Amino acid sequence: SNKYLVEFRAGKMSLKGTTVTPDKRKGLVYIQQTDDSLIHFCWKDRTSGNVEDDLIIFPDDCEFKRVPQCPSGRVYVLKFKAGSKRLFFWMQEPKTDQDEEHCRKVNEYLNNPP
Amino acid sequence: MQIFVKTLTGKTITLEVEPSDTIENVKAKIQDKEGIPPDQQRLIFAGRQLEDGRTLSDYNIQKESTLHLVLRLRGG
Amino acid sequence: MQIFVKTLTGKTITLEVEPSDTIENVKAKIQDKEGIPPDQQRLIFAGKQLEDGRTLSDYNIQKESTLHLVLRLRGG
Numbered sequence: 001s002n003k004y005l006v007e008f009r010a011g012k013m014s015l016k017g018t019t020v021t022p023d024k025r026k027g028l029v030y031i032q033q034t035d036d037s038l039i040h041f042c043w044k045d046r047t048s049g050n051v052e053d054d055l056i057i058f059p060d061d062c063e064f065k066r067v068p069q070c071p072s073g074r075v076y077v078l079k080f081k082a083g084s085k086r087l088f089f090w091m092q093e094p095k096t097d098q099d100e101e102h103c104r105k106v107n108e109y110l111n112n113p114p
Numbered sequence: 115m116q117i118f119v120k121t122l123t124g125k126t127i128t129l130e131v132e133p134s135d136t137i138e139n140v141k142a143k144i145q146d147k148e149g150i151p152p153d154q155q156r157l158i159f160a161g162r163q164l165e166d167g168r169t170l171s172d173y174n175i176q177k178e179s180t181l182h183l184v185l186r187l188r189g190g
Numbered sequence: 191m192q193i194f195v196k197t198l199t200g201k202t203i204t205l206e207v208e209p210s211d212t213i214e215n216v217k218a219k220i221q222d223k224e225g226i227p228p229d230q231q232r233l234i235f236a237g238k239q240l241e242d243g244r245t246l247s248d249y250n251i252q253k254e255s256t257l258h259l260v261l262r263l264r265g266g
Contacts, residue, residue: 083255
């Protein structure tokens with residue numbers, strides 16, 4: 001069924017020096033299971049179609065959650081439960097209505113895959 | 115209530131907290147007592163990574179519980 | 191250097207290793223101390239599954255890091 005398990009519009013952020021900086025580009029976050037059965041959490045630049053981030057994630061490696069204190073209410077973090085590693089994203093879906101459902105789906109497919 | 119924080123070097127630190135405290139607060143108490151910057155702290159309880167804006171009660175952490183502290187600044 | 195290996199049952203084992211050690215060697219140390227056969231061990235660090243022929247330095251694993259151990263074929 002389809003290619004992606006989950007996809008949604010979102011921008012990424014990068015650490016420049018010691019500063020977390022939102023990347024302004026229109027992006028797509030997605031989860032794909034490849035034929036080796038591994039689960040990939042990816043970010044793709046929509047304009048170029050380049051997949052810039054592609055992380056193999058195993059169950060319980062990480063949690064995707066809203067960053068509450070951002071006035072946008074649309075920043076999410078993929079937090080690696082072991083280590084300090086965090087990847088920040090910002091929802092680019094025009095309506096906020098599905099933000100929490102997208103987040104819920106990320107967690108399901110990373111932490112409970114088939 | 116007293117809780118225990120076990121680090122990877124076999125040191126365990128005891129903290130006095132309230133269930134109403136946020137994870138951010140806990141991290142600040144650990145910085146205050148052992149000097150580890152909050153940005154380097156990853157706190158684990160019952161196989162969940164604890165998030166800064168939640169409280170200890172959110173996770174059902176009761177007196178004399180042990181949290182695990184992993185540092186690993188950067189990310190491989 | 192000391193590293194921590196966290197298992198799915200909430201047990202954490204401490205190991206003494208060198209960055210130059212291979213993943214195969216680490217698995218043998220875990221077998222020696224907890225009895226788990228290397229073929230059942232899956233080691234995870236910074237969301238990567240560790241491969242037997244690489245060394246800890248390949249992955250930038252520094253002192254007091256925590257690796258996660260998942261066992262092939264988990265009960266329940």
